[PDB]
């Protein structure tokens, strides 16, 4: 029948962000990131797979692996891996053993750490930042970070204002671009300052045309001649190009879109109506055939919110369908076959082979046999319409042993659009143990924000947020991007309560990042939620305005101390603490002044609240926005268990992750105000 | 005499440590002199024969503190740092150092990565504090012990205390040890870092050694034999304490256990004076004095007859004493007079002279300094000094620059607590007349003390609007009324006049430029108080001024006073020299620039990217460039004078773009 979920199961759910298929298509390699208890952090397990037979051989375990590709012209592979000495460029031979290729002897420190460069991640050293092969595999382009060595200098004006939010010492780096010829000689193309985000962040696009190699920089698209060794300064650099050579896009609103391709001269060509959205970062991405007559694009459908593939060619648009979602996919050179990761809400991930000609999906071995032995929970995909007329997709996750005529306490978990068809996606659940809540008898409602692509009202308000000013009115910006989401949660809880599924007396809500903002807005604007947990928040608070000016100016119209202050007092949650009757827990990695402002405001208002600040590996390190430390991930999941058990169920937990706490939570309940 | 240079203001020595032998025939003092090779100050230890006057140079070190004479012997003891961290050393009667107590693993401290923030220059401290027993047989000392444990999850007030962190910190505890005459050491107790008196008071009674700990305070006693624990300055001969009444001009000195010693011309027990010392028998004491008016430091002898103060022709800052309080060796200091060592006979009140401290500064032609006080429109007087330019004749107009830090304008030689990075000596040599002016003295009126009490207390009375007036706004008027008074005499050109200051003086510079049209240019060193960005950290000190939070119903008090919101009232050139890079300092810069005011903020770094610069600059490369930037700033804006000596050349072009974009 299968065993129930445990806490370590949610921790060890593997992530596959790297999969590569050989050019001939007979071999493939992929790496599964799995949380390691002995290491205290995740480690990537590299595995080779025979596409024909289905045999999977475990090769080697490393720290990190990125940019996994197949070397053109050979049967080998290349990747950026870290063995603990810093990220370098390695070659994996056709039999699956890795040996160094390019090694920076002086890798610079990166991430949130003392004396490190704030790239934009887990603390580590990066020897080789990015690389790409030429189409024939003869030439190798790569970039590496070089720590700028000079004495500390006086800084002036905007140099000083950029240091406002600094929590730690930092260093300064430059980005070197190198090119190696077929003879093994390397020459430096150019150097770029840290101010270039295209060069520092890496992972960018680079094209090979004739004698030139072209890539992107920020001070343009720059070109380097292989022989002349000269530098000079198009939509060919853009993702999502079609078989005709134009830009792919989807137009329309509401239920279905229309997939079109616009040529560089501006003449559009429509492939007809489509039920899906194009080019999501969580989908399979995009790939073009060598001849350019066939492309594949990753898709995310409206409604069911499933990921898949779509084939574009001269005749039109055709998408192959599967019984689950295809997230990450490899392809061969001819685009005639693919190896993908098949994923679903309650079904663990599996490797599958896809023949793009016949649309036949042949199944391969499962990725995590540990999670195949777990009895799948009951999940029902459902969309809810609110009082403002907006629909929000999501999932209703039932408790174990649920039978009809059962009332259960509920917990709402929301992050962005990330509630979809995928297996235990950490971008959604975060530290909230959605699986373990159901085993203990909770109904977990996974619900997104109202999808902005349904209505012109939500798109115009979202545009003003990214733009940094109106129109529309900042008063409506608060309504469309925040307040109407509170209504979508209240109307979804009462709708299930009218069906007898949920006890309205006991209902929780949780979220982080975008979901943290939703939690902080609902708790102020709604009495319907008894307990709440806001992961790593701080947006919308007045303490973070100076850093976030352009993002705040759309919501509040201006500074907190300007004439717009009355907008700050009506909306911002830290000023609204008097409207809050609920239990607000803050799980905080960053310890920003905006999160502390929300804590000191709720505590001064008599509201029962606690802020939990999880540290890094040492005193010189921090924790990433999503927790990469297992000891922090496990205790954060248990803290949410103990928090929602105490306030919703009046249940004291013997497994509580921190001692002498429930004692303190009693003193908070005794001090609650009359309101 | 040769004229002042920029390196002379840098190399002016500080002596914070002087000790006289028990018999009184030998003495030691340490002179802190900025070193160009080391790029920071280094202390030169020197031994002195008071009879002959010979001064022998023993050894140069990094830092030295707590220099005392070991009771019962002819040797001394001090906390010195040779580069391996601060430890406790012994100085034998011939003047050579050898270790006494050495902590093999000192903890890093200061503003630095992976360091503990006591509350200073980055370094390692092996031995924190020490004190001898009266007989010298017992030795009490404390040392910092780095707390070793993994990082943990913090909750509630643990998180809020980290709001203002710029760097990674470690945690320590303070161990207290006691060494018996046989040489065996026993640990008295351990205190957490939250104890301030332990990290930053010991008495000896019988078999007990008593000190003070904070938990909010307690007095505990350790038994030297039983080895058990339990809970239980400025003293006169009769045992009663010493306080001063008699406001206004003179003062009355009283000893209260209610004796009265009569009228006195000075105030009592300032940190800048010689301090306090009591005789063994207890019939004679000596106290450091600071006089009203002339603002000179000196000594006062109290006995079973009365109070008698000895007077010299200059100020005595640091003084050592012998066991019987019959003699003293002191540092004689003056405004235009370089420091010099002197011996004082306390019985006969005669001062015999010894060699100079800094022969480098004895060859400089003394500038003309005139002590002068000014009365403002509010009826308050502000002491200070006016310093004439070189080659000045009567009936000459000159451009002016006002430099203010606290009460620190007084009779002393180039005190860095006052001038800071503003080169008042080199400004006079270049044709500037510099007015060194203090705040209105708070001891002159009950209106100033009551407002000062509310600031320290963190709430009224008096009214917050009067706290802005008494501690700030009336100091603006003192500057304006003193400038127009000198302009009426023909000394000062009112069109071109500067103002500068740091810390307290930075706050005065920020309020004047907002509340006054009289000053053309301004330089505010390492400021940020009174700004709304620093409320969450400084709540108590801010609550007195503004009455509450910036977003509360007190906002209208913030909009009228706080300089960041008043930038529209600023027509001037405001420069910020900034070590800390606080969010309050950045808020002041972003506010002035957004209002069209010409302004610039200069952020000076530490030795490494892992270290910071202290409040007063200890890095010679940072001090020299900070002095040059002020000259180039005031020469450009006041005199329209472009400088070929400018420290950063890219600026004067940018300053032109600031001048062209000025509003009306």
PDB file of C-alpha atoms in Angstrom, chain A residues 16 32-33 44 61 69 76 101 113-114 119 130 166 189 286 373 416 445 473 478 556 573 617 632 644:
ATOM      1  CA  UNK A  16      17.096  17.718 -11.249  1.00  0.00           C
ATOM      2  CA  UNK A  32      20.014  14.973  -8.785  1.00  0.00           C
ATOM      3  CA  UNK A  33      20.440  17.438  -5.925  1.00  0.00           C
ATOM      4  CA  UNK A  44      24.562  16.601  -6.419  1.00  0.00           C
ATOM      5  CA  UNK A  61      28.804  12.769  -5.833  1.00  0.00           C
ATOM      6  CA  UNK A  69      26.093  19.959 -21.872  1.00  0.00           C
ATOM      7  CA  UNK A  76      31.923  13.287 -23.949  1.00  0.00           C
ATOM      8  CA  UNK A 101      39.555  20.800 -18.281  1.00  0.00           C
ATOM      9  CA  UNK A 113      29.901  35.774   3.310  1.00  0.00           C
ATOM     10  CA  UNK A 114      32.707  37.867   4.726  1.00  0.00           C
ATOM     11  CA  UNK A 119      27.050  37.755  -7.172  1.00  0.00           C
ATOM     12  CA  UNK A 130      30.528  30.506 -17.536  1.00  0.00           C
ATOM     13  CA  UNK A 166      25.427  46.232   3.682  1.00  0.00           C
ATOM     14  CA  UNK A 189      39.075  38.793 -25.147  1.00  0.00           C
ATOM     15  CA  UNK A 286      13.448  26.267 -25.957  1.00  0.00           C
ATOM     16  CA  UNK A 373       7.334   3.617  -1.688  1.00  0.00           C
ATOM     17  CA  UNK A 416       3.337  33.287  -6.469  1.00  0.00           C
ATOM     18  CA  UNK A 445      -4.992  24.384   0.497  1.00  0.00           C
ATOM     19  CA  UNK A 473      -3.743  54.807  -9.299  1.00  0.00           C
ATOM     20  CA  UNK A 478      -2.745  47.993  -3.553  1.00  0.00           C
ATOM     21  CA  UNK A 556       2.498  54.182  -1.948  1.00  0.00           C
ATOM     22  CA  UNK A 573       1.320  46.101   7.627  1.00  0.00           C
ATOM     23  CA  UNK A 617      27.117  27.550   8.465  1.00  0.00           C
ATOM     24  CA  UNK A 632      17.768  24.798   9.455  1.00  0.00           C
ATOM     25  CA  UNK A 644       0.051  25.660  13.741  1.00  0.00           C
TER      26      UNK A 644
END
